[PDB]
Paper text:
In order to shed light on this fundamental mechanism, we studied S. aureus FapR (SaFapR) a transcription factor that senses the levels of malonyl-CoA, a key intermediate in fatty acid biosynthesis, and modulates the expression of genes involved in fatty acid and phospholipid biosynthesis. FapR has been shown to globally repress the expression of the genes from the fap regulon encoding the soluble FASII system as well as two key enzymes that interface this pathway with the synthesis of phospholipid molecules. Like most transcriptional regulators in bacteria, FapR is a homodimeric repressor. Each protomer consists of a N-terminal DNA-binding domain (DBD) harboring a classical helix-turn-helix motif connected through a linker α-helix (αL) to a C-terminal effector-binding domain (EBD).
The crystal structure of full-length SaFapR in the absence of ligands has been obtained in two different crystal forms. Interestingly, in three out of four crystallographically independent protomers the repressor has the same non-productive quaternary arrangement as observed in the structure of malonyl-CoA-bound SaFapR, with helix αL bound to the lateral face of the EBD, strongly suggesting that this compact structure likely represents a conformation of the protein in solution. However, the helix-turn-helix motifs display high temperature factors or even partial disorder, and are engaged in extensive crystal contacts, suggesting the coexistence of alternative conformational states in solution characterized by flexible DBDs. In that sense, in one protomer of the crystal form 2 both helix αL and its associated DBD are highly flexible and could not be modeled, suggesting a marginal stability of the observed quaternary arrangement. Moreover, the first visible residues of this same monomer (positions 72–77, connecting helix αL with the first β-strand of the EBD) adopt a conformation that differs from that observed in the other ligand-free or malonyl-CoA-bound protomers, but resembles that found for one subunit of the asymmetric DNA-bound form of the repressor. Similarly to other homodimeric proteins studied by single-molecule or NMR relaxation approaches, our crystallographic studies suggest that the two conformational states of SaFapR (i.e. with EBD-bound or EBD-detached DBDs) can be populated in the ligand-free repressor species.
Numbering used by the authors:
A (entry chain B), D (entry chain B): 72 to 189
B (entry chain A), C (entry chain A): 6 to 189
Amino acid sequence: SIEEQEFIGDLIQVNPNVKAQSILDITSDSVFHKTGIARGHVLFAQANSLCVALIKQPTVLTHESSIQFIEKVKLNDTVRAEARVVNQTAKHYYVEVKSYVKHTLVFKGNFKMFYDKR
Amino acid sequence: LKLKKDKRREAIRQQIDSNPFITDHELSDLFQVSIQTIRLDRTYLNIPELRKRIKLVAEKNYDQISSIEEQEFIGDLIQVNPNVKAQSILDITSDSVFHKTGIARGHVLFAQANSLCVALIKQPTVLTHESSIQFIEKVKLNDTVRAEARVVNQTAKHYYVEVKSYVKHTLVFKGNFKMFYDKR
Amino acid sequence: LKLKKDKRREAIRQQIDSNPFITDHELSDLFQVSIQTIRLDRTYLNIPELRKRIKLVAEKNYDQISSIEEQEFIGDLIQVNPNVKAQSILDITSDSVFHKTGIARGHVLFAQANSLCVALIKQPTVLTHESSIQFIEKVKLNDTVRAEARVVNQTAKHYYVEVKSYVKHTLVFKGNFKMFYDKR
Amino acid sequence: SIEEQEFIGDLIQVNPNVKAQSILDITSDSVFHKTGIARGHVLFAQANSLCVALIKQPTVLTHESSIQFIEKVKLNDTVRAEARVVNQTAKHYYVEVKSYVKHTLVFKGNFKMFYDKR
Ligand SMILES: [Cl-]
Ligand SMILES: [Cl-]
Ligand SMILES: [Cl-]
Ligand SMILES: [Cl-]
Ligand SMILES: [Cl-]
Ligand SMILES: [Cl-]
Ligand SMILES: [Cl-]
Ligand SMILES: [Cl-]
Ligand SMILES: [Cl-]
Ligand SMILES: [Cl-]
Ligand SMILES: [Cl-]
Ligand SMILES: [Cl-]
Ligand SMILES: [Cl-]
Ligand SMILES: [Cl-]
Ligand SMILES: [Cl-]
Ligand SMILES: [Cl-]
Ligand SMILES: [Cl-]
Ligand SMILES: [Cl-]
């Protein structure tokens, strides 16, 4: 169940502290059974868990985010999430994630992530 | 001076009929008896513990909705008026938090909020198009987050939903949701 | 793009079934149509104006209680769970206020609060023994004060009730009530 | 109806700005019909409207009050309320009211009244 998972998807390319990509197969757990359509929060968890993974800081907490679910994702798609750090301050990393199915943008998020060295 | 047993028990049944989510502790303070007394009173009355009562209230709610089912729904659906407003609670357990700090991961609260909005809308097809969210306070291991969803606009193609999430009385999460829908 | 008439009307009926106290203005903002449209929709649906809907909801409530009757009750009793919690609203009119300032007299809000506590408790005999009250903000001509009463303790002889009163979302009045009761 | 009345009872003695007494007959409007017992708020309105009456200030607003309903008042009683000013500051008058039926105390209130010269 999505809320009980740490990192969602498989990491396939990572450049620590800079950018990363993960892939996620869309199985029947991730969709509504009558339509076959992925649940927004599965794609969100992939994007947000990717940001947390790539940021090399002891603690990383999501402060804010804006997301668009641009296309319907379907049972049996593979969603490639591509994350990159746009800016970094003393307190935040600003991270953009664009997720694809083959070559069509299906999801875009902006993440404002808090961090600290504890 | 304190209530006779039979009067106290009638009064417990009434409290619970009116607020199923009232705790043993709160009942205890209400009647100025021990938690033990409240527990023994529940046993006599066949009133299940709080967590069982929540799952029972929620079962009734899953029948009122259509966009999502119990198996997929994140948290327990405690209150629903389809197309108008809804609430859920989510107990935050060890799998939802970082090991060192005990803080809930970002996607946990979003997952509660998004499924609440999906559940809220009773149309053949429903899905989130856009969302905007803020994490207002750290949520912690063993907290219960109560999410409140309400419809604020409805167009031909979208429901705009506003979500506020609480731990006790503190606001911890806030989100706007643009819900796409279609009757086909 | 906006809802077809028949869809809008279904959606109005649902909004009102779920919150009888929703205003034409609020319905208007919800569906992004004019107040005129909402009014004409109510007429088509035979939904009475807000104030009529309040008196109707309240009639049902007077049957649930026993300590007080409609004729004596100050305000309209909008929500009641006997021995647990209740709410009323009171429209503040010219007779309740000073001429120069338009401020509600002290005893008006106390009168709403006291009858709410009396109404709340469902015992043969009920009366206030003690009360402690604060007037937190000036209440004004043509405001609606919403009073919220809840039971916080029950002994063999008393219900302790806590009252909070609001104008929109501002707290304006606060009171503790020690209610005597007896079953004879 | 009590909330639609300005001054409750008849004034029978007044010493402006200092102390006053009023009497109130308890008719069937002021009681619950099944018990015959006066409503707390009728006695409160008598006490509080008496304070407001006796204070000689352009505006007088009740800020706080503590009251005790010491005896049951009954249909056909006359309640004599006796009010007096205990203290006065630049912003408040502190007023005590004790109300009687014949010679038995049936009600006691303390009132903290705000005032201003507008
Ligand atoms: Cl780096
Ligand atoms: Cl979704
Ligand atoms: Cl930067
Ligand atoms: Cl793109
Ligand atoms: Cl008893
Ligand atoms: Cl409990
Ligand atoms: Cl005990
Ligand atoms: Cl439990
Ligand atoms: Cl908690
Ligand atoms: Cl439509
Ligand atoms: Cl209205
Ligand atoms: Cl219009
Ligand atoms: Cl109206
Ligand atoms: Cl108002
Ligand atoms: Cl003087
Ligand atoms: Cl009373
Ligand atoms: Cl003085
Ligand atoms: Cl005395």
